[PDB]
A paper describes a structure:
Nef from human immunodeficiency virus (HIV) or simian immunodeficiency virus (SIV) is a 27–35 kDa viral accessory protein that is dispensable for replication but required for high infectivity and virulence. Notable among Nef’s functions is the interaction of Nef with TCRζ, the principal signaling component of the T-cell antigen receptor. In previous work, SIV and HIV-2 Nef have been shown to bind TCRζ at two unique sites denoted ‘SIV Nef interaction domains’ (SNIDs), the first containing elements of immunoreceptor tyrosine activation motif (ITAM) 1 and the second containing elements of ITAM 2. The Nef conserved core domain (Nefcore) has been described to be responsible for the majority of Nef’s interactions, including the TCRζ-binding activity of SIV Nef.
In the presence of the longer 43-residue TCRζDP1 polypeptide SIVmac239 Nefcore crystallized in the tetragonal P43212 space group with one SIVmac239 Nefcore–TCRζDP1 heterodimer comprising the asymmetric unit. M was calculated to be 2.86 Å3 Da−1 (57.1% solvent), indicating the presence of one SIVmac239 Nefcore–TCRζDP1 heterodimer per asymmetric unit. All of the twinning tests suggested that the low-resolution SIVmac239 Nefcore–TCRζDP1 crystal was not appreciably twinned, whereas the high-resolution SIVmac239 Nefcore–TCRζA63–R80 crystals were pseudo-merohedrally twinned with a twin fraction near 0.5. In order to determine the low-resolution structure of SIVmac239 Nefcore–TCRζDP1, the high-resolution SIVmac239 Nefcore–TCRζA63–R80 structure was used as the starting model for refinement and building. The TCRζDP1 peptide extends 12 residues futher at the N-terminus and 14 residues further at the C-­terminus compared with the TCRζA63–R80 polypeptide, but no additional electron density was observed beyond that seen in the SIVmac239 Nefcore–TCRζA63–R80 complex, suggesting that both the N- and C-termini of the TCRζDP1 fragment were disordered and that no additional Nef contacts were present. Surprisingly, the hydrogen-bonding network between the TCRζ polypeptide and its bound SIVmac239 Nefcore partner is seemingly absent in the tetragonal crystal form; this explains the lack of electron density calculated from the P43212 data for the N-terminus of SIVmac239 Nefcore since the PPII helix would no longer be expected to be ordered. Instead of participating in a side-chain–main-chain hydrogen bond with its bound partner, residue Gln65 in TCRζ is translocated in the tetragonal crystal form, bringing it into close enough proximity to residue Gln202 on the neighboring SIVmac239 Nefcore protein to participate in a side-chain–side-chain hydrogen bond. The main-chain–main-chain hydrogen bond between the TCRζ polypeptide and the neighboring SIVmac239 Nefcore protein is also lost in the rearranged P43212 crystal contact interface.
Numbering used by the authors:
A (entry chain A): 107 to 180, 200 to 234
B (entry chain B): 63 to 78
The structure:
Amino acid sequence: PLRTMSYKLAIDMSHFIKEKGGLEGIYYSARRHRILDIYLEKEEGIIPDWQDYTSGPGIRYPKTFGWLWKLVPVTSQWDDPWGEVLAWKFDPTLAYTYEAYVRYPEEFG
Amino acid sequence: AYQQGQNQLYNELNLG
Protein backbone atom coordinates (compact mmCIF):
# COMPACT_ATOMS: atom_id res chain seq x y z
CA PRO A 1 0.00 0.00 0.00
CA LEU A 2 1.27 3.49 -0.94
CA ARG A 3 2.09 6.08 1.72
CA THR A 4 4.14 9.24 2.14
CA MET A 5 7.05 9.04 4.57
CA SER A 6 6.23 9.99 8.15
CA TYR A 7 8.43 10.26 11.25
CA LYS A 8 7.72 6.91 12.90
CA LEU A 9 7.99 5.63 9.33
CA ALA A 10 11.46 6.93 8.45
CA ILE A 11 12.48 6.28 12.05
CA ASP A 12 11.63 2.59 12.35
CA MET A 13 13.05 2.18 8.84
CA SER A 14 16.45 3.73 9.57
CA HIS A 15 17.11 0.97 12.09
CA PHE A 16 15.57 -1.82 10.03
CA ILE A 17 18.36 -1.13 7.53
CA LYS A 18 21.19 -0.83 10.04
CA GLU A 19 19.95 -4.02 11.68
CA LYS A 20 20.36 -5.51 8.20
CA GLY A 21 23.94 -4.27 7.93
CA GLY A 22 23.01 -1.83 5.19
CA LEU A 23 24.53 1.45 4.01
CA GLU A 24 27.08 1.76 6.81
CA GLY A 25 30.31 2.81 5.11
CA ILE A 26 28.97 2.24 1.60
CA TYR A 27 30.06 4.66 -1.12
CA TYR A 28 27.55 7.10 -2.58
CA SER A 29 26.58 7.89 -6.16
CA ALA A 30 23.66 9.86 -7.58
CA ARG A 31 22.83 6.52 -9.18
CA ARG A 32 22.97 4.60 -5.90
CA HIS A 33 20.79 7.35 -4.43
CA ARG A 34 17.84 6.47 -6.66
CA ILE A 35 18.68 2.82 -6.02
CA LEU A 36 17.70 3.47 -2.42
CA ASP A 37 14.63 5.56 -3.25
CA ILE A 38 13.35 2.50 -5.08
CA TYR A 39 13.95 -0.22 -2.49
CA LEU A 40 11.59 1.64 -0.15
CA GLU A 41 8.93 1.82 -2.84
CA LYS A 42 9.11 -1.80 -4.05
CA GLU A 43 9.54 -3.28 -0.58
CA GLU A 44 7.87 -0.77 1.74
CA GLY A 45 5.71 1.25 -0.66
CA ILE A 46 7.18 4.53 0.55
CA ILE A 47 6.76 7.68 -1.51
CA PRO A 48 10.39 8.60 -2.37
CA ASP A 49 9.58 12.32 -2.12
CA TRP A 50 11.48 12.12 1.15
CA GLN A 51 15.11 11.46 0.27
CA ASP A 52 16.88 14.82 0.07
CA TYR A 53 20.01 16.39 1.59
CA THR A 54 21.98 19.60 2.17
CA SER A 55 24.10 20.84 -0.73
CA GLY A 56 27.11 21.16 1.55
CA PRO A 57 29.94 21.13 1.26
CA GLY A 58 31.44 19.13 4.12
CA ILE A 59 29.01 16.71 5.73
CA ARG A 60 25.66 16.26 3.99
CA TYR A 61 22.60 16.02 6.22
CA PRO A 62 19.09 14.69 5.34
CA LYS A 63 16.22 17.10 4.65
CA THR A 64 13.86 14.53 6.18
CA PHE A 65 14.10 14.45 9.98
CA GLY A 66 13.83 11.01 11.55
CA TRP A 67 16.25 9.76 8.94
CA LEU A 68 19.33 8.47 10.75
CA TRP A 69 21.89 8.32 7.93
CA LYS A 70 24.34 11.09 7.00
CA LEU A 71 26.73 11.53 4.06
CA VAL A 72 30.34 11.97 5.19
CA PRO A 73 33.35 12.70 2.90
CA VAL A 74 36.56 10.65 3.11
CA THR A 75 35.37 10.96 -12.19
CA SER A 76 31.82 10.06 -13.24
CA GLN A 77 28.58 11.91 -14.11
CA TRP A 78 26.97 10.66 -10.91
CA ASP A 79 29.99 12.22 -9.19
CA ASP A 80 29.79 14.93 -6.50
CA PRO A 81 28.92 18.60 -7.21
CA TRP A 82 31.45 19.50 -4.50
CA GLY A 83 34.05 17.12 -5.91
CA GLU A 84 34.04 15.35 -2.57
CA VAL A 85 33.55 11.67 -1.83
CA LEU A 86 30.52 10.63 0.22
CA ALA A 87 29.61 7.50 2.16
CA TRP A 88 26.64 6.56 4.35
CA LYS A 89 26.93 6.44 8.15
CA PHE A 90 24.43 5.97 10.98
CA ASP A 91 23.75 8.70 13.54
CA PRO A 92 20.94 8.63 16.14
CA THR A 93 21.55 12.30 16.99
CA LEU A 94 19.64 13.10 13.81
CA ALA A 95 16.56 11.73 15.55
CA TYR A 96 16.84 14.42 18.22
CA THR A 97 18.80 17.07 16.34
CA TYR A 98 17.61 18.53 13.04
CA GLU A 99 21.20 19.13 11.96
CA ALA A 100 19.72 20.38 8.69
CA TYR A 101 17.87 23.48 9.89
CA VAL A 102 20.56 23.70 12.57
CA ARG A 103 23.42 24.47 10.20
CA TYR A 104 21.67 25.07 6.87
CA PRO A 105 18.31 26.68 7.73
CA GLU A 106 18.51 28.68 4.50
CA GLU A 107 17.64 25.62 2.41
CA PHE A 108 13.93 25.55 3.33
CA GLY A 109 11.18 27.12 1.23
CA ALA B 1 14.51 -9.93 -15.13
CA TYR B 2 12.39 -7.43 -13.18
CA GLN B 3 12.89 -8.99 -9.75
CA GLN B 4 16.53 -9.80 -10.59
CA GLY B 5 17.61 -6.51 -12.15
CA GLN B 6 16.08 -5.08 -8.99
CA ASN B 7 17.90 -7.48 -6.64
CA GLN B 8 21.39 -7.12 -8.14
CA LEU B 9 21.08 -3.39 -7.50
CA TYR B 10 20.03 -3.96 -3.88
CA ASN B 11 23.28 -5.91 -3.59
CA GLU B 12 25.37 -2.75 -4.06
CA LEU B 13 23.95 -1.67 -0.70
CA ASN B 14 24.20 -4.94 1.25
CA LEU B 15 20.57 -6.06 0.87
CA GLY B 16 19.00 -8.98 -1.01
